[PDB]
Design an enzyme around this catalytic site. Structure first.
Site, mmCIF file in Angstrom:
data_model
loop_
_atom_site.group_PDB
_atom_site.id
_atom_site.type_symbol
_atom_site.label_atom_id
_atom_site.label_comp_id
_atom_site.label_asym_id
_atom_site.label_seq_id
_atom_site.Cartn_x
_atom_site.Cartn_y
_atom_site.Cartn_z
ATOM 1 N N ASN A 73 83.641 -89.149 6.788
ATOM 2 C CA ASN A 73 82.613 -88.849 7.775
ATOM 3 C C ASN A 73 81.294 -89.592 7.692
ATOM 4 O O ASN A 73 80.482 -89.506 8.612
ATOM 5 C CB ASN A 73 82.348 -87.345 7.813
ATOM 6 N N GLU A 140 86.089 -93.221 14.168
ATOM 7 C CA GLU A 140 86.527 -91.955 14.740
ATOM 8 C C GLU A 140 85.452 -91.743 15.792
ATOM 9 O O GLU A 140 85.704 -91.837 16.992
ATOM 10 C CB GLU A 140 86.482 -90.833 13.697
ATOM 11 N N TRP A 233 88.026 -72.012 6.335
ATOM 12 C CA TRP A 233 87.945 -73.399 6.755
ATOM 13 C C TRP A 233 87.467 -74.253 5.583
ATOM 14 O O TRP A 233 88.098 -75.256 5.237
ATOM 15 C CB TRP A 233 86.987 -73.581 7.928
ATOM 16 N N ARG A 264 86.536 -74.763 15.046
ATOM 17 C CA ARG A 264 87.782 -75.446 14.742
ATOM 18 C C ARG A 264 88.952 -74.840 15.485
ATOM 19 O O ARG A 264 88.791 -73.880 16.235
ATOM 20 C CB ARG A 264 88.051 -75.355 13.241
ATOM 21 N N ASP A 360 96.474 -86.443 11.470
ATOM 22 C CA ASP A 360 95.134 -85.880 11.375
ATOM 23 C C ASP A 360 95.178 -84.489 10.747
ATOM 24 O O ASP A 360 94.229 -84.065 10.090
ATOM 25 C CB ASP A 360 94.493 -85.812 12.761
ATOM 26 N N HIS A 397 78.008 -80.780 4.001
ATOM 27 C CA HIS A 397 78.564 -80.890 5.346
ATOM 28 C C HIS A 397 77.493 -80.762 6.432
ATOM 29 O O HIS A 397 76.469 -81.440 6.380
ATOM 30 C CB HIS A 397 79.640 -79.805 5.495
ATOM 31 N N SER A 448 82.483 -86.383 2.158
ATOM 32 C CA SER A 448 83.153 -86.941 0.984
ATOM 33 C C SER A 448 82.439 -88.136 0.356
ATOM 34 O O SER A 448 82.065 -88.097 -0.817
ATOM 35 C CB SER A 448 84.604 -87.314 1.321
HETATM 36 C C1 LIG Z 1 86.979 -78.033 2.885
HETATM 37 C C2 LIG Z 1 86.903 -79.137 3.886
HETATM 38 C C3 LIG Z 1 85.865 -80.123 3.689
HETATM 39 C C4 LIG Z 1 85.623 -81.367 4.635
HETATM 40 C C5 LIG Z 1 86.642 -81.491 5.838
HETATM 41 C C6 LIG Z 1 87.688 -80.536 6.141
HETATM 42 C C7 LIG Z 1 87.881 -79.345 5.212
HETATM 43 C C8 LIG Z 1 88.961 -78.374 5.501
HETATM 44 N N1 LIG Z 1 86.703 -82.682 6.577
HETATM 45 S S1 LIG Z 1 85.969 -82.274 8.362
HETATM 46 O O1 LIG Z 1 87.144 -81.994 9.168
HETATM 47 O O2 LIG Z 1 85.162 -81.070 8.373
HETATM 48 O O3 LIG Z 1 85.271 -83.335 9.015
HETATM 49 C C9 LIG Z 1 86.049 -83.916 6.146
HETATM 50 C C10 LIG Z 1 86.493 -85.233 6.596
HETATM 51 O O4 LIG Z 1 87.389 -85.387 7.392
HETATM 52 N N2 LIG Z 1 85.797 -86.424 6.001
HETATM 53 C C11 LIG Z 1 84.712 -86.328 4.992
HETATM 54 O O5 LIG Z 1 84.165 -87.240 4.536
HETATM 55 N N3 LIG Z 1 84.361 -85.073 4.594
HETATM 56 C C12 LIG Z 1 84.925 -83.882 5.055
HETATM 57 N N4 LIG Z 1 84.681 -82.583 4.331
HETATM 58 C C13 LIG Z 1 83.802 -82.434 3.459
HETATM 59 C C14 LIG Z 1 84.095 -82.858 2.007
HETATM 60 O O6 LIG Z 1 85.371 -82.482 1.542
HETATM 61 C C15 LIG Z 1 82.829 -82.369 1.114
HETATM 62 O O7 LIG Z 1 81.630 -82.780 1.671
HETATM 63 C C16 LIG Z 1 82.986 -82.702 -0.290
HETATM 64 O O8 LIG Z 1 84.256 -82.379 -0.956
HETATM 65 C C17 LIG Z 1 81.792 -81.872 -1.143
HETATM 66 O O9 LIG Z 1 81.921 -82.200 -2.570
HETATM 67 P P1 LIG Z 1 81.479 -81.150 -3.678
HETATM 68 O O10 LIG Z 1 80.061 -80.653 -3.257
HETATM 69 O O11 LIG Z 1 81.530 -82.010 -4.814
HETATM 70 O O12 LIG Z 1 82.465 -80.003 -3.566
HETATM 71 P P2 LIG Z 1 84.093 -80.142 -3.990
HETATM 72 O O13 LIG Z 1 84.666 -78.922 -3.366
HETATM 73 O O14 LIG Z 1 84.626 -81.363 -3.783
HETATM 74 O O15 LIG Z 1 83.999 -79.815 -5.561
HETATM 75 C C18 LIG Z 1 83.520 -78.770 -6.327
HETATM 76 C C19 LIG Z 1 84.265 -78.656 -7.720
HETATM 77 O O16 LIG Z 1 83.639 -77.634 -8.458
HETATM 78 C C20 LIG Z 1 84.674 -76.778 -9.047
HETATM 79 N N5 LIG Z 1 84.060 -75.613 -9.476
HETATM 80 C C21 LIG Z 1 83.494 -74.579 -8.681
HETATM 81 N N6 LIG Z 1 82.958 -73.635 -9.379
HETATM 82 C C22 LIG Z 1 83.127 -73.965 -10.651
HETATM 83 C C23 LIG Z 1 82.763 -73.344 -11.983
HETATM 84 N N7 LIG Z 1 82.101 -72.185 -11.953
HETATM 85 N N8 LIG Z 1 83.139 -74.023 -13.238
HETATM 86 C C24 LIG Z 1 83.848 -75.288 -13.251
HETATM 87 N N9 LIG Z 1 84.228 -75.951 -12.026
HETATM 88 C C25 LIG Z 1 83.853 -75.257 -10.763
HETATM 89 C C26 LIG Z 1 85.803 -76.913 -7.820
HETATM 90 O O17 LIG Z 1 87.014 -76.309 -8.599
HETATM 91 C C27 LIG Z 1 85.861 -78.427 -7.388
HETATM 92 O O18 LIG Z 1 86.687 -79.203 -8.308
HETATM 93 N N1 LIG Z 2 81.128 -83.735 19.687
HETATM 94 C C1 LIG Z 2 80.729 -84.398 18.617
HETATM 95 N N2 LIG Z 2 79.756 -85.416 18.658
HETATM 96 C C2 LIG Z 2 79.311 -86.141 17.550
HETATM 97 N N3 LIG Z 2 79.860 -85.850 16.301
HETATM 98 C C3 LIG Z 2 80.851 -84.816 16.230
HETATM 99 C C4 LIG Z 2 81.351 -84.036 17.316
HETATM 100 N N4 LIG Z 2 82.312 -83.116 16.898
HETATM 101 C C5 LIG Z 2 82.339 -83.390 15.601
HETATM 102 N N5 LIG Z 2 81.501 -84.396 15.111
HETATM 103 C C6 LIG Z 2 81.540 -84.628 13.972
HETATM 104 O O1 LIG Z 2 82.490 -85.524 13.325
HETATM 105 C C7 LIG Z 2 82.758 -85.262 11.991
HETATM 106 C C8 LIG Z 2 84.158 -84.478 11.800
HETATM 107 O O2 LIG Z 2 84.039 -83.291 12.800
HETATM 108 P P1 LIG Z 2 84.436 -81.948 12.317
HETATM 109 O O3 LIG Z 2 85.872 -81.856 11.986
HETATM 110 O O4 LIG Z 2 84.010 -81.166 13.404
HETATM 111 O O5 LIG Z 2 83.806 -81.643 11.029
HETATM 112 C C9 LIG Z 2 81.428 -84.670 11.490
HETATM 113 O O6 LIG Z 2 80.879 -85.928 10.990
HETATM 114 C C10 LIG Z 2 80.623 -84.235 12.751
HETATM 115 O O7 LIG Z 2 79.280 -84.694 12.759
#
Ligand SMILES: Cc1cc2c(cc1C)N(S(=O)(=O)O)[C@@H]1C(=O)NC(=O)N=C1N2C[C@H](O)[C@H](O)[C@H](O)COP(=O)(O)OP(=O)(O)OC[C@H]1O[C@@H](n2cnc3c(N)ncnc32)[C@H](O)[C@@H]1O
Ligand SMILES: Nc1ncnc2c1ncn2[C@H]1O[C@H](COP(=O)(O)O)[C@@H](O)[C@H]1O
Ligand SMILES: Cc1cc2c(cc1C)N(S(=O)(=O)O)[C@@H]1C(=O)NC(=O)N=C1N2C[C@H](O)[C@H](O)[C@H](O)COP(=O)(O)OP(=O)(O)OC[C@H]1O[C@@H](n2cnc3c(N)ncnc32)[C@H](O)[C@@H]1O
Ligand SMILES: Nc1ncnc2c1ncn2C1O[C@H](COP(=O)(O)O)[C@@H](O)[C@H]1O
Ligand SMILES: Nc1ncnc2c1ncn2[C@H]1O[C@H](COP(=O)(O)O)[C@@H](O)[C@H]1O
Ligand code: SF4
Ligand code: SF4
Ligand code: SF4
Ligand code: SF4
Ligand code: NA
Lengths: 642, 149, 642, 149
Positions: A73, A140, A233, A264, A360, A397, A448
């Site tokens: 993203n 995207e 989610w 979603r 996807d 996020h 990520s």
């Molecule tokens: C859940 C989820 C997240 C996203 C999305 C879809 C879905 C369904 N999609 S989109 O569709 O939305 O868009 C993305 C996408 O397509 N592209 C992208 O770049 N990012 C998306 N995210 C976001 C990224 O995944 C996110 O920004 C990063 O992973 C954040 O990283 P971080 O803040 O490091 O969190 P992590 O979850 O990766 O890791 C945390 C770790 O900590 C552990 N942990 C937690 N508590 C702990 C404890 N007490 N002791 C020891 N370990 C302990 C966890 O086990 C994990 O290993």
């Molecule tokens: N309608 C939209 N216009 C611009 N960015 C969007 C839109 N819907 C989702 N995004 C996003 O695109 C990424 C993935 O969307 P999402 O699965 O909704 O998390 C995130 O980077 C958001 O900022």
């Protein structure tokens, strides 16, 4: 609900303690933590420093990226490697506008200028990025690129393992509390945890600690409460651990009122980003109206935010909420019309985009593909219902809740440096304690790539901090023993009171983790702007929430656990309760509704840029059990215009 | 949530570790020492991430959609290799779809974290540059951003 | 969620069948059922008829009155035994207006002219009725009297047992389906059931069958989903069994869209009747506003319903729904101000009413007193939160969902007699099949006294039917055998497919009862005007509900059960699913919103007295698997004016 | 929900029937043949009606409020007699309230269902009158209701 097959009980005094001495301790081996481990290993050589990574599960698949992701993203593209180049100024503008005017631009600009390098490394390491016939990264939307990311985490995990060495990675160890320097009340000295595979208490002594535990989920009751309570989610694996331990240590939180409500695919919560941005899918209400059109005028009152492009996410949610309140559900993602339009009658073209559509989902949220399979939904024939899920608290996020952290010396203005005893990039108000990924607040849209990147940034800063300040924290053995007793107290309480009832889970002297969690979810759902009230709340509801959370917090002292798994669950609950309290107190403090669509203060329904264009920061003093709030006015750091 | 097929599960024969128990991000997969077969110990905490499914060398793990919203009959079955992954999606109505996606462009375990990077220096430690920068960013110099006048 | 300690499995072919021959079979030993047993025993002597009462639990405490009740909600008082006398015409008017203009006045006037005799017998049998110093029954409101009713059900159970005889009462036997005359597709011939204490299949052959199973609860997701999923305001023991078996037999349903949404104390669901009517308690929003007054204008559009006194129940709900939609909660019942004002400074008087306040709960819904105790709420010091619960389907209270039944010869107009092959009081459209209490629709406000009374009415009519028509239906042995196979099918399915998974409750070939119930509740909650959408729905949502219920009904064929307890749970689910389908189809058919406060059709938001002042009656034809609907215009039977 | 105190439950082994198992309206109370002690088999289906609590001769059953909304510490304990019932309400904060209410004005098992009623007759069977009417209603004549002209 949890029903252990057999007991696995231990008394604190029967559990052996393992002491681990290190220089940099990274808590959480997810995307931000792996970024920290990777970068830390590089600079650590300058002082022969030891870098340790602790993870409660297994780094190969732990965290939010366990299933993989279908896109990255955040990729600015400053050279033209993708279908669309962008500028850093436009990105900073984008994020601040999405935050409805409130974002730490020094922090955003900082990860933004570093993120592309991280992405390029990911590809070098084997991540397959979608490419056009011309060899360009496939876009995207404007800021994201498509990827074949089923193995996204395993690849990043390998990079971190190769960098720090497997001997420096502790898995299946749950960290539950930080340790402070008994030489200095506002300095970190390490942390404590316990194994979930054997009876072993861990004491980590460190000079610098980096919180990378991910955000917090399951604080609010979900839209499915049976088995599907597990279909959150966001990562169900993240339970606000970093938030809890950091706030208890006295590290200040910021924008904790800023939750994220994801719109979603309904129930399965499959991604909509690709469908909206890549497939050009339209979302229409039950009557076929594209509400982003019919509800456009309602955003006019949010000038200039409402007139921004892209329209702020919360405002997009607001349009959805208006439709929901008017009773125009179901809301549909018309995938069938999107695919037909894109294929243009070309059957081979349709087959190709159809495969892309399923990838996807299969590369990131299989449950949505499984849902389609179970409900006989063929995306090329019929649309799918969509809906907003319950609230989640994270800062990587679209939400920006997390710790108030220091920015880079070249971008952070004086206005933002006042609360930091030491000026090190991503360090909290507690000396030696850093926060990254979901744990770092006020600088969202990292996702990520950005989360891994923020981890890299904090890691270098941690090495610099260690070599420059030369800290030598001393842990308080008295406190450590107290924490060890607390760690296994639930197991001892179970053994001490289980005989009061013929049923292990119906006891008057204790609550099991799942029982306390159901209670927390109900409280937050009903009083803290959960789905129950269509994300609405007010002073009275929030105050009642604090009263109920107070009862629950007191009852945490009577938590019971039957095995190591449930003991971890018990502490994950404790972490969530405090995160919830912080969230409620922050929502109570800000007297305005800046992010309609995420939450509404019916008693202060308007956005107030005259009195509230500021970050809300808070500090919890454990000794006095008092919360203090402060308003830090927003200042534009980067040059841009609406 | 995930579930183990008793007929295919061998409690992980003589290998060094139990794959499903080792991989689960939420600590759900565990072994029943009695049967010597695995099971999901807390299904309502299953994220249906399919990690266990993909890593079971016997293919003894499948996923049955959450009962809250899933009619019976659907299934998604992965066959993960080294450079790609195959999926078979079976609908409640009998429809069967097959896909195959790339997952990695390089050999597993081949990452050289700092390949080609110069050695770190005390002087570099004081700059804003991360490992590999500004070279890995692809720009002609470290990216500059205009500060608000 | 259910986790049996051990298995209790049986195959149909190995379970012995016990055949019971009787003349009158009463299904359900609750208030209406005990009334039928009592009255039937009296008249049966005329023909030496056998009367049989079958109950799934134990009559002593079974049904809605298990905890007791704090008042008798229906006592007209035609002679002055209470503090307030009333007339029958005034009562009929009251019920019709409360129903927003729709009630079978022939049926209402009928039970009303008989109800006082029932109440007098209750007192004669030992029920302690509150009395004034002058010896008058203490009135709660205009139609109710206060009672010391902790043992209300045990007393009524004793009366029924003394009347019919213990050897004619079958307990712990669950009836799951009716049997019809092999030579007449529209005549009842008996019923089938199974013991929940031993492996025994029951075949009841009868000339007349009286459905007295109570209404249906848990069709909708409650406000608490964990342990408190069991805290439903209405009887969790009633799962729409009568509705299911009767509709399957082809008996017509009426007003099934007319659910009841009770406004009660939050979470514990304690009663509000006494607080409002006896203690003169005020209900206010979070800002001290008495919404019954501030929302008075919103009722003016309803003519003449909005100007009726008291305000119709649904409209009272509508006012609080408006407050909820505006986000003005918590809503409070100001018990503290009510007690202070009633006592008037007299401390002894305060102590007396304080004890009365607690009895109101301890005699009927102990959970509310327990909630107060756990949350440290002293009603004399602080108010209690209140809220509307999820929907319940029943015809004895303020809802009129149930079977279309025949009225008395002297009151029923020809307009209402058309669909009955035989004109016997309370007989359904299926010959020989009667419905009472919650099972009889279109004649609400019966409550405890009225339900017992309606049972008495049907019982006498059943004896008259048998002696006059000399019914002699023959059961179809082939059908009985098929039903016996179906009865235990869930157990056989469990045994057949359990080996597919190492976990009994995670199987791809079957769903357990609790799993199917979670699914049903989610469907109804989200699409059928449940709490999720603040009781709003439309055509699209209702149509989607039917699609999802279709998937669930198909999956009922794959239900599994691990013991007799769960086998009963399996059939209780089956019963709820069909009840839910009927409810959705009825709401879909009626194109208006006549009971705002109970449910709103956002696509037809207005009340339509021009084309919808009619009862909606439906029939399900099992052989064709088709539903047919028809409108029966309401006609005023009793003399009264607004 | 209800829960059984092991120290007080004797499995009703000195009685002809198990009281709690017999009384529960939702079939939740059952005996663990192993311990010969009762337990609530499905607490989330408990209506907290207190029937089992009132009928346990050993006073071995109590109720622990649903975890969804109940803080620990509260309790309502009844002591049911023949003509009245006593209640003790104990608050989480320690406050204790005591109440006593009447439950019956006649001896148990003393009901004569048709006491004073004349015998039923074929002629009476055709009228609208129920047993004991019209006199049990309090009127010498059957109540009349005006039908609309
Ligand atoms: C859940 C989820 C997240 C996203 C999305 C879809 C879905 C369904 N999609 S989109 O569709 O939305 O868009 C993305 C996408 O397509 N592209 C992208 O770049 N990012 C998306 N995210 C976001 C990224 O995944 C996110 O920004 C990063 O992973 C954040 O990283 P971080 O803040 O490091 O969190 P992590 O979850 O990766 O890791 C945390 C770790 O900590 C552990 N942990 C937690 N508590 C702990 C404890 N007490 N002791 C020891 N370990 C302990 C966890 O086990 C994990 O290993
Ligand atoms: N309608 C939209 N216009 C611009 N960015 C969007 C839109 N819907 C989702 N995004 C996003 O695109 C990424 C993935 O969307 P999402 O699965 O909704 O998390 C995130 O980077 C958001 O900022
Ligand atoms: C649940 C509840 C109900 C009320 C109230 C508070 C609460 C918390 N309070 S106030 O708040 O409104 O005020 C009342 C009050 O104060 N005063 C009053 O008169 N009525 C009140 N009701 C209403 C009355 O109780 C109600 O009108 C009558 O009980 C209805 O009689 P009936 O329709 O007969 O239902 P039942 O629940 O009594 O009995 C049904 C029987 O059927 C059994 N059964 C079910 N299905 C079965 C199967 N398939 N086969 C075998 N038997 C199978 C049940 O086990 C039960 O024995
Ligand atoms: N505000 C009110 N005005 C008139 N009748 C009411 C009111 N609240 C409840 N009743 C009722 O009194 C009885 C007990 O109410 P409840 O316990 O709410 O079911 C029922 O007969 C209702 O009709
Ligand atoms: N959360 C959301 N709910 C409904 N529509 C959204 C959401 N996020 C983005 N959109 C919009 O995404 C697209 C942006 O449209 P446009 O600005 O015309 O380029 C439309 O397809 C909308 O559906
Ligand atoms: S990885 Fe597969 S074979 Fe090994 S224990 Fe788990 S399920 Fe059984
Ligand atoms: S699907 Fe994921 S969360 Fe569920 S048991 Fe398997 S690995 Fe664990
Ligand atoms: S009634 Fe009491 S003593 Fe008897 S089995 Fe039940 S709990 Fe035990
Ligand atoms: S409280 Fe009532 S519903 Fe609960 S177990 Fe006891 S008798 Fe059964
Ligand atoms: Na009334």
């Amino acid at each position: 609900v949890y029903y252990p097959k057999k007991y696995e009980l231990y008394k604190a005094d029967e559990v052996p303690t393992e002491v681990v001495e290190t220089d940099i301790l990274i808590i959480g081996g997810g995307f931000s933590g792996c970024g920290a481990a990777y970068e830390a290993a590089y600079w650590a050589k300058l002082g022969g420093l030891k870098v340790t990574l602790v993870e409660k599960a297994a780094v190969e698949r732990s965290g939010a990226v366990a299933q993989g992701l279908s896109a990255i993203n955040t990729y600015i593209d400053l050279t033209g490697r993708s279908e669309r180049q962008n500028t850093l100024e436009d990105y900073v503008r984008y994020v601040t506008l999405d935050m409805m005017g409130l974002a730490r631009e020094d922090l955003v600009a900082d990860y933004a200028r570093h993120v592309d390098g991280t992405v390029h490394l990911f590809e070098k390491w084997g991540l397959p990025i979608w490419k056009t016939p011309d060899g360009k990264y496939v876009r995207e939307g404007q800021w994201q690129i498509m990827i074949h990311g089923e193995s996204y985490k395993p690849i990043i995990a390998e990079a971190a393992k190769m960098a720090v060495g497997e001997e420096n990675i502790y898995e299946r160890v749950f960290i539950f509390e930080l340790l402070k320097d008994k030489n200095d009340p506002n300095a970190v000295a390490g942390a404590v945890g316990f194994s979930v595979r054997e009876p072993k208490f861990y004491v980590f002594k460190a000079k610098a600690v980096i919180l990378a535990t991910g955000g917090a989920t399951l604080l609010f009751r979900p839209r499915s409460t049976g088995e599907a309570a597990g279909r959150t989610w966001y990562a169900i694996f993240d339970t606000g651990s970093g938030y809890y331990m950091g706030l208890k240590a006295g590290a200040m939180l910021t924008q904790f009122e800023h939750r994220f409500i994801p719109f979603r695919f309904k129930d399965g919560y499959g991604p909509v980003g690709a469908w909206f941005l890549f497939f050009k899918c339209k979302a229409k209400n039950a009557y076929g109206e594209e509400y982003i059109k019919t509800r456009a005028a309602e955003l006019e009152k949010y000038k200039p935010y409402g007139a921004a492009q892209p329209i702020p996410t919360p405002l997009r949610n607001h349009q959805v909420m208006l439709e929901i309140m008017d009773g125009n559900q179901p809301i549909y993602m018309h995938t069938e019309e999107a695919l037909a339009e894109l294929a243009g009658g070309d059957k081979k073209k349709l087959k190709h985009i159809y495969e892309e559509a399923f990838e996807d989902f299969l590369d990131m949220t299989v449950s949505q593909a499984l849902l389609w399979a179970c409900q006989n939904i063929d995306p090329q024939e019929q649309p799918s219902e969509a809906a907003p899920a319950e609230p989640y608290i994270m800062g990587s996020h679209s939400g920006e809740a997390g710790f108030w952290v220091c920015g880079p010396e070249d971008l952070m203005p004086e206005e933002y440096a006042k609360l930091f005893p030491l000026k090190y990039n991503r360090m909290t108000t507690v000396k030696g304690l850093f926060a990254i990924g979901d744990c770092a607040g006020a600088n969202p849209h990292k996702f990520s790539s950005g989360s891994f990147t923020e981890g890299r940034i904090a890691a270098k800063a941690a090495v610099r901090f260690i070599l420059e300040q030369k800290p030598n924290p001393e842990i308080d053995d008295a406190v450590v023993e107290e924490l060890k007793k607390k760690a296994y107290a639930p197991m001892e309480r179970f053994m001490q009171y289980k005989d009061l009832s013929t049923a292990d889970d119906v006891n008057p002297e204790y609550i099991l983790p799942w029982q306390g969690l159901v209670r927390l979810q109900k409280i937050m759902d009903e009083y803290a702007a959960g789905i129950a009230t269509i994300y609405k709340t007010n002073e009275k509801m929030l105050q009642r929430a604090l009263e109920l959370l107070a009862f629950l917090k007191e009852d945490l002292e009577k938590l019971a656990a039957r095995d190591l798994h449930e003991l971890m669950r018990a502490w994950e609950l404790v972490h969530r309760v405090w995160t919830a309290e912080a969230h409620v107190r922050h929502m109570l403090f800000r007297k305005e509704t800046r992010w309609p669509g995420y939450y509404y203060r019916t008693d202060y329904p308007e956005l107030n840029d005259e009195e509230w264009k500021c970050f809300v920061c808070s500090k919890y003093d454990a000794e006095k059990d008092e919360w203090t709030f402060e308003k830090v006015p927003y200042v534009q750091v980067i040059e841009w215009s609406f | 949530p995930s579930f183990v097929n008793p007929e295919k599960c061998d409690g992980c024969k003589a290998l060094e570790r139990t794959a499903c128990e080792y991989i689960c991000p939420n600590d759900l997969m565990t072994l029943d020492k009695e049967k010597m077969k695995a099971y999901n110990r807390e299904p309502d905490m299953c994220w249906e991430c399919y990690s266990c499914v993909k890593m079971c060398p016997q293919g003894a793990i499948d996923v049955r959609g959450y009962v809250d919203y899933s009619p019976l009959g659907g299934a998604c079955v992965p066959m993960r290799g080294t450079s790609d992954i195959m999926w078979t999606v079976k609908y409640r109505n009998g429809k069967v779809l097959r896909f195959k996606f790339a997952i990695r462009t390089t050999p597993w375990g081949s990452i050289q974290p700092f390949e080609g990077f110069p050695e770190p220096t005390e002087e570099a430690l004081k700059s804003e540059l991360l490992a590999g920068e500004p070279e890995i960013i692809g720009t002609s110099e470290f990216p500059q951003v205009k500060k608000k006048a």
